[PDB]
Structure formats: structure tokens, C-alpha cells
Amino acid sequence: RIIYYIQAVIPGRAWLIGSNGSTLTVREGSKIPGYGMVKLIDSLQGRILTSSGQVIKFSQEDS
Amino acid sequence: RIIYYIQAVIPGRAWLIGSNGSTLTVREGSKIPGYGMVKLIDSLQGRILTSSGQVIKFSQEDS
Amino acid sequence: RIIYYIQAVIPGRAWLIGSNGSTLTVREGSKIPGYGMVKLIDSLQGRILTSSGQVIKFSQEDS
Amino acid sequence: QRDLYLSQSKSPPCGGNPTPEMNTFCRTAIPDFISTVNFVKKQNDDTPKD
Amino acid sequence: EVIDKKAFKDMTRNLYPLNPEQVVKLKQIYETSEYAKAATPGTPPKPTATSQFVNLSPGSTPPVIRLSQGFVSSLVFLDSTGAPWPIAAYDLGDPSSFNIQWDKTSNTLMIQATKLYNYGNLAVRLRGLNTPVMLTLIPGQKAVDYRVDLRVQGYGPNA
Amino acid sequence: PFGAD
Amino acid sequence: PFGAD
Amino acid sequence: PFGAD
Amino acid sequence: PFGAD
Amino acid sequence: PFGAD
Amino acid sequence: CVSMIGGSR
Amino acid sequence: CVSMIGGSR
Amino acid sequence: CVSMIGGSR
Amino acid sequence: CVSMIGGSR
Amino acid sequence: AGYNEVQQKQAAATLSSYFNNLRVYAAQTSVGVSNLYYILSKRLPQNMSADQ
Amino acid sequence: CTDAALAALEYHKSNA
Amino acid sequence: CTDAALAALEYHKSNA
Amino acid sequence: CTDAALAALEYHKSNA
Amino acid sequence: CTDAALAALEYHKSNA
Amino acid sequence: QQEIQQRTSDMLTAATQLVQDWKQVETQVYTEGT
Amino acid sequence: QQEIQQRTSDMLTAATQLVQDWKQVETQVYTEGT
Amino acid sequence: QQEIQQRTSDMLTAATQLVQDWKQVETQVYTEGT
Amino acid sequence: RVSIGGTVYTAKKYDD
Amino acid sequence: RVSIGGTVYTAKKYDD
Amino acid sequence: RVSIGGTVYTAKKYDD
Amino acid sequence: RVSIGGTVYTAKKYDD
């Protein structure tokens, strides 16, 4: 599938960058292709829980 | 049918954009094509409860 | 027949616009065509009740 | 003296952001002083009804 | 050394005496309060751009212009052919409740109702007309005459 | 102040 | 102060 | 203030 | 002040 | 304040 | 004649 | 007619 | 809706 | 996570 | 209205002489500021051609 | 509401 | 939630 | 960490 | 030095 | 018994306020076009 | 029983400034382009 | 019983200035290009 | 409810 | 809850 | 934890 | 030792 990494995150919105170069913005509840819908957005640790158990983190080579 | 998603809401009026691009503003009691009449406008939640039971929310790609 | 809608209302005079484009102004007591004579003007709700039981409101489009 | 103030209400001390005490004295009138003074009633007040 | 941590507990108490939970609490009460103010009570007036024909025959009622407190309403003046009709001048009746602005050449007057409920009347002396056009102006109505086409009975310098 | 506002 | 916010 | 920061 | 106002 | 400095 | 804002049910 | 921000559940 | 700054384990 | 100038041996 | 004429004209004279002192003062200043502003104004640029 | 208005109106026009 | 606001609305529109 | 966040979130969504 | 630092690190990681 | 006079001072102080707002009649203004 | 009057005084100080802000309306502006 | 009132005073002075930092809005600027 | 002449006449109790 | 007539109309207890 | 409605909803005890 | 969350987490006793 397509891999997203949280480009930058604040309480509420979180802007994401994917492996296709696509950019997106997500809130507490928002649909993501493949990942499902976001359950939570922790800006403190740069982490997002989505429904599929998949965990969105800052990309390794930028964090 | 034609799905209209909310563009803006305050206590009272609510400005709505359709699937055909038509724009409208609505109050407590007004006739909307299809959904019937607005029953209540919940402003901070960005919600409209109509007579036909259909709930009008902000567009997912807009909220 | 010709349906008149409310054009604006304040305590006393009420200005009114119909399907023929004619504009009129009405007080507590006046002969208004078709509906007979106006029993009262309720300004804070935007209503005109007349003798014939017919009730004049702001049009659905302009309210 | 109250008449003197109220003849100039457009000007202080009865106008122009007056202090609330002066404002109150501008509002209130002067009661009759002789009528309030009565000794039989206050005498009854001092003595117990018993 | 217990003194150091006891003092510092008292310190995270007093220098930042609104802990982060309480800071966000105060943020939300402030937000809810100003929103509760900003909410216009009842439904607000509906923004409606209307078109009306001005008849200057005797016995006709003057056109009605609906305002809203703090909002701009643009009256444009057109003749029977729909072309712009420039304004020669105007006179504000009760300028204490309405403020009109208008560049000296155009045919458009924009109006704000400065107070909320006071209604008045407004005269506009037009370019080619001998009888001017007078309109009643009422604010606080269930709608705003958001921009109004005035189809004056006459013919202007543009045909 | 009426209820049909 | 709603819960569906 | 969590322990996975 | 009359009633036929 | 370490000892491997 | 009626002042409706002077209304009371 | 409802100013729901004065709301209580 | 969650402000984890007001968070507590 | 660890600031070891906040270090105690 | 509980007034009279003695201190009426008295205080009238006092305030009026006060403002009179103000205006004579102000005229004497206007003299000096007028010459200073003329010295300043001999040295300001002026536009000679009407067309900019 | 309105019925109070009719009652008050007729009571006014009944008493001069 | 919405039931409280709607109930308040009907009770307001029922009591003039 | 997160578990308190989910618990408080569902508690706020359940108690409106 | 290092071992005390890692012990404090794991203590902070385990206690959220 | 004195509450009526206290609200008397308040109610007059407000009523005079409304009435001299009422006596306010501004002058009308004209803008002559270019 | 002093609580009611104390808190009402705080209410006057608040509500007066609120109504004073809501009385405020400012004049619109007109920016004429070049 | 005095701790409650002293601490209410400390963070009422706090909350006032937090609100003041919230009420400020600093206007944007326009820099225009040569 | 009060008219324009000065006299006050009111309805007693009327609901809608 | 408060209406626009100035009189107060509130619901009693409703949750979702 | 606190919501945006102004009413405080918190979890009890949750460790990760 | 003190973490970033503000809660103090320390080791007890260690040496090298």
C-alpha cells in the first residue's frame, strides 16, 4: 500500500506526507485510504492511531 | 439525489453548498428539497437535523 | 388569486410585496384585497393576520 | 441647596461622572424632619409590651 | 535535602499556578464565552439580493430597503433598459442611524445601518430625472437587502 | 415575548 | 457544552 | 506528559 | 386619550 | 555530573 | 395601538 | 429560537 | 476533543 | 527524554 | 434660581479675564511661531509645473 | 402569543 | 445530546 | 500514555 | 554515568 | 417601604436617559455629486 | 446572605462593559482603487 | 481555610493576563516588491 | 401592554 | 436555555 | 483531561 | 533525573 508519515502535528490537525508525494490534513476523526479512520492524534509524540491498528509516526529520516 | 454539505454555520443561518454547486442559506424552519424542513441547527457541532431524519454535516474533505 | 408576502414589518406599518410585483403598506386597520381587512400586525414574529383567516408571512425565499 | 444643584444638572457635581455618594444625594429628596420626631411611639418601643 | 524538593513542589505550585489542564480549561471557557456573545440571537437576517421596479407615479409607495446592523447594502440604479444611471446627489434622512458611502461618479450607494432598529428615508437626486427617488430604509428585518437593483421608471443617459 | 417566534 | 463535538 | 514521548 | 385611536 | 568525563 | 414587544402570555 | 451554547446535557 | 496536555497516566 | 546534566551517580 | 448679581459679575469678570490672558498669550505665541514657520517655509520644496 | 394580543386589543377598544 | 435542545425547543414553542 | 486518552475520549463522548 | 542514565530512562519509559 | 423610593431614583435616572435620547434629532446631510 | 449582593456587583461590572461593547458599531471604510 | 482565597487570588491574576495574551491580534504587514 | 394615549389595559392570561 | 423573548425555557434532563 | 465544551471529563487510571 | 513531561523519574543507586 501507500505509506504515510506525519509531516507535522499539532493538537487537532495533523499534516501528512505520503510515499507518492501527496500531502493531506487529518483531524480527530477522518478517513484515510487504506488505514481506515483516525482514532487519535497525539501531537506530543508525533503519533496517530487509525482504526486498522496501523500507527502513523514521523518518518525515520526526518524525525 | 443531490447531497449538500455545509459550508458554514452560526446560530441561526447556515450556508450550504450542494453536489451541483448551488448555494443556500437556511434558518430554523425552512424547506430544503428532499430532506423536507430543517428541524434544528447545531452550530458548534456543525450539524443540521432535518425532518426526513437525514443529518447534514460538513463535507469530509472540507471539515 | 394573488398571494402577498411580507416585504418588511415594524410596529404599525408593514410593507408588503406580492406575485404581481406591486408593493403596499398596511396599518392596524386597512382593506387589503382578497384577504379582506387586517386584524393585526405581529412585528416581532413577522406575521399579518387578517379577517378572512388568511395569514401573511415573509416568503420562504426572503426570510 | 438641592434646588441649586438641580438647576445645573448639566454640570457637576450632579453631572459629569459624579461619585456615587454625590449621585445619591442628587437623586434623593429631603424628608420632612418635624413629622418623623414623635415621642409616644418611640416610648412604646423602648418599654416592653409586657 | 528534602527541603529542596518540598520547596520545588510549592514552586511548580506558585510560579505556574495554572497547571496545563487548567490552562486549557480557561481557554475553552474563554472561547465558549466569546462565541456565546458573537452568536446573533434568533436567526440572523437572510442575505438576499433583490430587484425592485421604482414607480414614480403619484400614490405609489416608496421602495423599501432592508438593512442590518453593521452590514453594507449596495443599491445600484438602473433605468428601464437596465443600464446604469449615475447619481447626481443624495440626501440622508436621519444620518444618525445610517451611513452612506458613494464615490462621486458611480451609480451605487452602499449603506450601513449604524443603529439596529431605527428606520428612516433617503432621497437620491438622479442624473436625468426631475423627480428624485426616495426609499424607506428599515434595519433589523428578517433579511438583508444585500444588493438591490432599482429599476427606475425613466430612461437614463445610457440606452 | 411570544412562543411562536 | 455538547458531547457530539 | 506521557511515558512514550 | 380615547379608545378609538 | 559523571565520572567518565 | 398594540405594542407587541410589550407582550406577555 | 435556541441558543444552544447555553446548553446543558 | 482530547487535550493530552491536560493528560495524566 | 533523558537530560543527564540532570544526572546523579 | 437662588442666584444674585454681585458674585455673578465678579466671577464672570474673573473667568473672562482668564481667557483674555489666554488669547493674548496665544496671539503673542502665534507671532513667534509664524516667523519660525516662515523661516521653515522659505526652505520647503514647491511644485512649479501643474502637470506632475 | 397572539391570543393575548387580540384579548388586549378588544379590551382597549372596549374601554375608551 | 440533541434531545435536550429539541425538547427545550418544543417546550418553548408550546409555552408562549 | 494513550490508554488514558482513549478512556477519557470515550468518557467525554458517552457523557455529553 | 551510563548505567544509571539507562535505568532512569527505562523507569521513565515504563511509568507513563 | 423604601425599596420603592430606591428604585424610584433608578427608574427616573433611566427614564430621563431615554427621553433626552428621544429629543435627539440630528441634522440631515447632502452629498453633491461631481 | 451577603453572597448574592457581592456576586451581583461583579455582574454589574461585567454586564455594563458587555452592553457597552455591543452598543459599539464602527464605520465601514471605502478604498478607492488607483 | 485561607489557602483557598490566597490561591484564588494568585491565579485570578494569572487568568487575567492569559486572557489578555488571548485577546491580542497582531495585524499582518504588506511589503511591496520593487 | 400599554397604548399610546397613556392608559394601560392588559389581557389577563392567554396562551397559544 | 434562553429564548429571544427574554424569558428562560430550559429542558430538564436529556443525554445521548 | 478536559473537553471543548468546558466540562471536565477525565479517565481514572490507565498506564501504558 | 527529570523527563520532558514534567514528572520526575529517577534511578535509585548505581555506579561504574
PDB file of C-alpha atoms in Angstrom, chain M residues 2 6-7:
ATOM      1  CA  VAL M   2      -8.804  15.382  23.745  1.00  0.00           C
ATOM      2  CA  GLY M   6      -4.099  18.033  30.237  1.00  0.00           C
ATOM      3  CA  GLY M   7      -3.129  14.379  30.170  1.00  0.00           C
TER       4      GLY M   7
END
